[PDB]
Design a protein around this ligand. Sequence first.
Ligand SMILES: Nc1nc2c(ncn2[C@@H]2O[C@H](CO)[C@@H](OP(=O)(O)O)[C@H]2O)c(=O)[nH]1
Ligand SMILES: [Ca+2]
Length: 104
Amino acid sequence: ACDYTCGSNCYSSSDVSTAQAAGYKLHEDGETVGSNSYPHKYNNYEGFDFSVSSPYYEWPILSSGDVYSGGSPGADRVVFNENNQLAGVITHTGASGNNFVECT
Ligand SMILES: Nc1nc2c(ncn2[C@@H]2O[C@H](CO)[C@@H](OP(=O)(O)O)[C@H]2O)c(=O)[nH]1
Ligand SMILES: [Ca+2]
């Protein structure tokens, strides 16, 4: 079973932790990867009711199992905060335009 289901993509908790660790490391060092500069601030315009405090940062999680290193980020993201606490896993899949919906 999937711990997180983003459209057709299936992720386990270990998939999420691995992605999160990479994005947080880059955040701590003040560095970014990709043309869209990840990780970067996630404003939560959608208004998700996260259990942890802001600010939030988004980082791509890939269905390939690889850690993001540039190029197309796909539709899925892991959102973490300043304390490296997982806020949630979100996706563009099943959402209008560039909006997000939570992965179930
Ligand atoms: N939909 C949405 N996009 C956000 C939010 N905060 C920041 N963004 C950025 O706006 C764009 C929406 O897809 C993305 O930028 P990017 O294209 O540079 O990756 C995304 O990172 C937010 O709360 N909601
Ligand atoms: Ca996996």
